């Protein structure tokens, strides 16, 4: 259960994204990997840029 709280806390830390965007596939796949990090001193901005470039990779029409 504690892992879900970590996922949701990281979701609000990234952008304050709404659960509606949490259901998005790019989020649905990467939130678990962002869970096994950000417990370190790494950054908050790095995760925003990572989500940016991954969401971009996802949408190549």
């Amino acid at each position: 259960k504690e892992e879900e709280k970590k996922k949701q806390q990281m979701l609000t830390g990234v952008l304050g994204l709404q659960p509606t965007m949490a259901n998005h596939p790019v989020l649905g796949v990467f939130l678990p990997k962002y869970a096994k990090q950000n417990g370190g001193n790494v950054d908050k901005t790095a995760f925003r840029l990572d989500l940016i470039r991954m969401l971009a990779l996802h949408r190549l029409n």
């Binding site: 796949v29 990997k33 990779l57 996802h58 190549l60």
Partner: protein, 269 residues
């Protein structure tokens, strides 16, 4: 933790056993012995293992090249001993020793091609010198000239170096029996160590070019199979498995595919 494909519990142990004790078996050529590459099969014909054995052999060649680049010892020791003999003994004999030649020819025949020599004619000049010091005129057996009791053992040592360049030994020039003294023992040591050095480096570059050619070969097949589907996990596995690779890229890429193992396993159909 030691990533492999949809693969069983016996073949994981056999692969990890081979890749761990890669140093001790002879003839390390993964191409030449087929007991491993045919073993890393998924099974059930062709349909249920084509893309999966493609990924699994990709991992196999990649970690073979990884353990190569992680486990090859330093050959610059044997080139250091080549520089020690070549510099100290023979130059002092040719100049300080007397009645030999001139500065420009001999000293630069030794000095030339410090880096990356494959030269046989320089070796032939030293073999002609030591043969002139010795008994006979022709150049039949020049490496330990005037004695053939060790020729088969030293050819066996060079063939064993070609087989397993990772575990190599230097035999020796024996002390009590010799045609001439310190000079001819220095020359025989110098020529054998030069042949050993160029043998180890050529066999190593052969295996490294083989492993890189196989990895770049399997990437195109893996990309051609994975290109068609349009799922996000599919195209992410496409990009991870289409990252370009070099020999100094392979270690970090193994660490990347370790963390990305959990997504491409689901991305495979």
């Amino acid at each position: 933790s030691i990533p492999f494909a949809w693969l069983d519990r016996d073949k994981v142990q056999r692969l990890t056993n081979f890749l761990s004790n890669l140093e001790n078996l002879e003839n390390v050529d993964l191409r030449e012995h087929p007991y491993v590459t045919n073993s890393c099969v998924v099974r059930e014909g062709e349909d249920v293992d084509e893309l999966k054995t493609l990924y699994n052999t990709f991992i196999l060649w990649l970690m073979y090249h990884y353990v190569l680049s992680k486990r090859k010892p330093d050959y610059n020791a044997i080139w250091q001993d080549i520089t020690k003999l070549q510099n100290v003994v023979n130059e002092y004999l040719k100049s300080k020793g007397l009645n030999k030649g001139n500065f420009e020819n001999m000293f630069t025949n030794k000095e030339k091609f410090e880096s990356q020599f494959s030269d046989i004619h320089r070796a032939l000049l030293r073999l002609g010198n030591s043969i002139r010091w010795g008994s006979n005129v022709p150049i039949d057996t020049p490496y330990v000239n005037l004695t053939a009791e060790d020729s088969s053992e030293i050819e066996n040592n060079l063939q064993d170096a070609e087989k397993n360049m990772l575990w190599y030994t230097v035999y020796n020039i024996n002390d009590p029996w010799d045609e001439n003294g310190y000079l001819v023992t220095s020359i025989n040591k110098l020529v054998y160590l030069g042949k050993l050095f160029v043998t180890l480096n050529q066999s190593w570059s052969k295996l490294e070019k083989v492993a890189m050619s196989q990895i770049v070969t399997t990437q195109n097949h893996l990309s051609g199979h994975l290109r068609k589907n349009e799922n996000f996990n599919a195209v992410y596995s496409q990009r991870v498995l289409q990252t370009p690779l070099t020999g100094q890229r392979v270690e970090s890429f193994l660490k990347i595919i370790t963390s990305d193992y959990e997504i491409i396993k689901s991305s495979l159909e």
